[PDB]
Amino acid sequence: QGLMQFTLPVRLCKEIELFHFDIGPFENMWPGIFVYMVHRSCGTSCFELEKLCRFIMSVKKNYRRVPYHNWKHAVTVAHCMYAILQNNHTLFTDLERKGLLIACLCHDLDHRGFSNSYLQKFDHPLAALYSTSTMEQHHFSQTVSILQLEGHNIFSTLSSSEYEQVLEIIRKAIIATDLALYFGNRKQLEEMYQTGSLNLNNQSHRDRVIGLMMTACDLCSVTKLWPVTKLTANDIYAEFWAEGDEMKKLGIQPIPMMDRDKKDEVPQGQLGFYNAVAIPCYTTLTQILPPTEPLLKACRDNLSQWEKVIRGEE
Numbered sequence: 001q002g003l004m005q006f007t008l009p010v011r012l013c014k015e016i017e018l019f020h021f022d023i024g025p026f027e028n029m030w031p032g033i034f035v036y037m038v039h040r041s042c043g044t045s046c047f048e049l050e051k052l053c054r055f056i057m058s059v060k061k062n063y064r065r066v067p068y069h070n071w072k073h074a075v076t077v078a079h080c081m082y083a084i085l086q087n088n089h090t091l092f093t094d095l096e097r098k099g100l101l102i103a104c105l106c107h108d109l110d111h112r113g114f115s116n117s118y119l120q121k122f123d124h125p126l127a128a129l130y131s132t133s134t135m136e137q138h139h140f141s142q143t144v145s146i147l148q149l150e151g152h153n154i155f156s157t158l159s160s161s162e163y164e165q166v167l168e169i170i171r172k173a174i175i176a177t178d179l180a181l182y183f184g185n186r187k188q189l190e191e192m193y194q195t196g197s198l199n200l201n202n203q204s205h206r207d208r209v210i211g212l213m214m215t216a217c218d219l220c221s222v223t224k225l226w227p228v229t230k231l232t233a234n235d236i237y238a239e240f241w242a243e244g245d246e247m248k249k250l251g252i253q254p255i256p257m258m259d260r261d262k263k264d265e266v267p268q269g270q271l272g273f274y275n276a277v278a279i280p281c282y283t284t285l286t287q288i289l290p291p292t293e294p295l296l297k298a299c300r301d302n303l304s305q306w307e308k309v310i311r312g313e314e
């Protein structure tokens with residue numbers, strides 16, 4: 001029917017509302033977690049259940065078994081968007097609620113565990129098709145593909161216009177997950193906020209703010225309980241070191257972040273990353289959207305955990 005509420009066990013029903021929720025090690029629970037979130041974030045109405053499930057499963061099929069950029073990441077990034085949307089209920093459009101959780105689930109579709117840099121140095125065909133934001137244009141493209149499979153059009157109820165608006169929100173959202181673009185995006189959002197020019201009625205300004213949300217969900221492994229934060233950092237380094245290995249195979253010394261012989265330098269690299277990227281992201285995000293403050297506090301706690309690791313205090 002449409003009298004078919006999804007529900008979660010008590011500890012999950014309560015903790016899922018919190019920014020620092022971990023979706024856990026039971027792969028088979030993640031789909032239902034996503035639907036739960038769509039239904040609460042959007043409504044039981046916004047998507048035909050049978051179509052949703054078929055889409056979610058095809059998206060899952062199209063994530064690979066890489067250590068980090070995998071289906072678990074997909075659903076983790078959707079959950080942080082869910083927490084932001086639920087703490088800023090009245091700021092977002094009907095179309096924005098629909099399209100943003102879907103953008104997040106799709107945002108790393110068919111990722112191979114290599115940076116856009118590697119694609120470019122290897123001379124991968126995707127580098128020729130898409131010169132900038134290489135994987136990000138691929139992920140958008142794979143999303144549109146899965147939307148076009150029979151029985152997969154979860155947007156079928158929208159008007160011709162709604163449809164192009166929602167697919168334009170997803171495309172920008174997914175493009176924004178390219179961290180090379182984050183720096184300029186946040187610097188402009190910072191000056192807009194501080195000269196008071198920021199105006200959520202300017203589509204151009206919304207666009208930037210959704211981009212920043214996108215970066216903030218994407219990095220949300222820096223906002224978890226220390227033991228999640230630490231064990232997730234291992235997964236991302238396993239991709240970085242394999243890429244370092246492949247750079248070496250093309251005859252290129254990798255940066256030390258990616259050199260698995262320079263493992264000692266992880267803790268100081270996380271510091272640099274928290275200082276250069278994460279802290280500034282969640283800072284500007286908290287200024288624009290005050291109820292997202294717990295992501296900043298959690299990030300700062302984790303920074304301080306990484307300083308303890310350097311000081312040999314663990």
Ligand SMILES: c1ccc2c(Cn3nnc4c(N5CCCCC5)ncnc43)cccc2c1
Nearest residue numbers: 179219221222232233236257269272273276
């Ligand atoms: C720009 C890009 C990377 C930089 C790095 C590399 N670095 N380290 N961690 C990450 C990362 N995750 C988020 C997920 C969990 C752990 C951190 N996502 C992307 N790049 C990362 C170090 C210093 C400055 C940087 C500037």
Ligand SMILES: [Mg+2]
Nearest residue numbers: 107108177178
């Ligand atoms: Mg990505």
Ligand SMILES: [Zn+2]
Nearest residue numbers: 073107108218
């Ligand atoms: Zn991602």
